[PDB]
């Protein structure tokens, strides 16, 4: 499957925070949307996920233009999403966090939902936290729970907004292995970051944004032929 955004634009109070941003991700790839703070990465993700309406451009999955579908409809089409800031249900246990999303799985029986919850906790190394409250988790543990909770919806594409933000260096490596695992499972993975040097090496392709504009794109090697990108990073 392929998820594509074509010439997205978004304005707030007449200011164009995103002017022209495109990107594409296929199943089995990690693709980066990378650039400085304020460049428009989260706004772009919001327009892809459907959390805000787009002012221009197109959002496409395969042969379906979904630019006008609401968040919930795109989610059923296979788009999953993880915000930068903590999104775990702090007052609920890890188990209940996963079961909360598994309740939308009309393709699974009550029993199967229970199975998947145990499966996800094994995969993401959080079984020992089954009954712990999200509040009591560390940044890295919290991130692993939130990612597993997103996968509970069985998405085709997972959009991770700065997944490494607010986690320790050991958890960064752990999250990087998780991302490789997701990719190997056939998901299309789209990640944002401002640390181009670090994140570029895990991307099959990336889209470098600055001030709401796409300024470079392609494989890391292609991107790093751009003198501006070389220098700044
Ligand atoms: C049918 O409803 C479902 C639930 O399903 C059942 N059957 O209940 C379950 O799916 C679920 O539950 C949630 C989800 C979110 C919250 C939540 O954001 C809380 N607020 C805090 O964390 C904060 C907020 C402010 C003020 C303080 C400090 C800081 C900043 C963090 C508390 C919260 O206190 O409880 C939540 C619950 C229970 O979502 C629901 C509600 C849609
Ligand atoms: N709801 C909003 N109203 C007005 N301006 C906003 C809103 N959300 C974001 N912005 C602005 O849009 C620009 C891009 O923000 P954002 O997409 O969050 O950038 P990034 O994720 O790349 O840091 C920023 O200048 C930000 O202040
Ligand atoms: Mg952001």
Curated annotation (Swiss-Prot):
Function in brief: Part of the ABC transporter complex LptBFG involved in the translocation of lipopolysaccharide (LPS) from the inner membrane to the outer membrane. Probably responsible for energy coupling to the transport system.
Top-rank taxon, per record: Bacteria
Cited PANTHER family: CONSERVED COMPONENT OF ABC TRANSPORTER FOR NATURAL AMINO ACIDS-RELATED, LIPOPOLYSACCHARIDE EXPORT SYSTEM ATP-BINDING PROTEIN LPTB
Enzyme Commission numbers on file: 7.5.2.-
Endpoints of the signal sequence: none
Residues binding ATP, per UniProt: 35-42
Gene disruption phenotype: Results in an earlier growth arrest and onset of cell lethality.
Domain ABC transporter: start-end pairs: 3-233
UniProt organism field: Escherichia coli (strain K12)
Enzyme class: translocase
Keyword Chaperone tagged: no
Subunit record text: Component of the lipopolysaccharide transport and assembly complex. The LptBFG transporter is composed of two ATP-binding proteins (LptB) and two transmembrane proteins (LptF and LptG).
Induction remarks: Transcriptionally regulated by sigma-E factor.
Keywords, comma-separated and alphabetical: ATP-binding, Cell inner membrane, Cell membrane, Cytoplasm, Membrane, Nucleotide-binding, Translocase, Transport
Membrane topology: Peripheral membrane protein
Keyword flag Ribosomal protein: no
One GO MF term attached to the UniProt entry: ATP hydrolysis activity
Gene field: lptB
Gene3D superfamilies according to UniProt: P-loop containing nucleotide triphosphate hydrolases
One Pfam short name: BCA_ABC_TP_C
InterPro entries hit by this protein: AAA+_ATPase, ABC_AA/LPS_Transport, ABC_transporter-like_ATP-bd, ABC_transporter-like_CS, BCA_ABC_TP_C, LPS_export_LptB, P-loop_NTPase
UniProt similarity note: Belongs to the ABC transporter superfamily. Outer membrane lipopolysaccharide export (TC 1.B.42) family.
Protein name: Lipopolysaccharide export system ATP-binding protein LptB
GO biological processes: Gram-negative-bacterium-type cell outer membrane assembly; lipopolysaccharide transport; transmembrane transport
